[PDB]
Design a protein around this ligand. Structure first.
Ligand code: FES
Length: 106
């Protein structure tokens, strides 16, 4: 029960990494050590916005609940639209199965 993911970069933008349904925090990327130019700016615990990165709106948009409370760190994550969503505290999912993550560039 594993799930694949795609990581966007700058050179060829189109990384990737195999994950497991139920992964832990600050996982996946690091799990493989993907480029992830930044690798958990804060180191997690919420503080940065370069963790989850852009998330297929078909995954994020599928959430009718988000406010100053939910955001916490987001708020106006330079680049955030309707797909990205800071996590660094969420386990993998079937939705992310073959998802393309893109850093907002910070
Ligand atoms: S690494 Fe900084 S909030 Fe996730």
């Amino acid at each position: 029960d594993k799930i694949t993911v795609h990581f966007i970069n700058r050179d060829g933008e189109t990384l990737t990494t195999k994950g497991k349904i139920g992964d832990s925090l600050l996982d996946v990327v690091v799990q493989n050590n993907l480029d992830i130019d930044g690798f958990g700016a804060c180191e997690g615990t919420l503080a940065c916005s370069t963790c989850h990165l852009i998330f297929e709106q078909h995954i994020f948009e599928k959430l009718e609940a988000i406010t100053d409370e939910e955001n916490d760190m987001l708020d106006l994550a330079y680049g955030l639209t309707d797909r990205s969503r800071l996590g660094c505290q969420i386990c993998l999912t079937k939705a992310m199965d073959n998802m393309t993550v893109r850093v907002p560039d910070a």
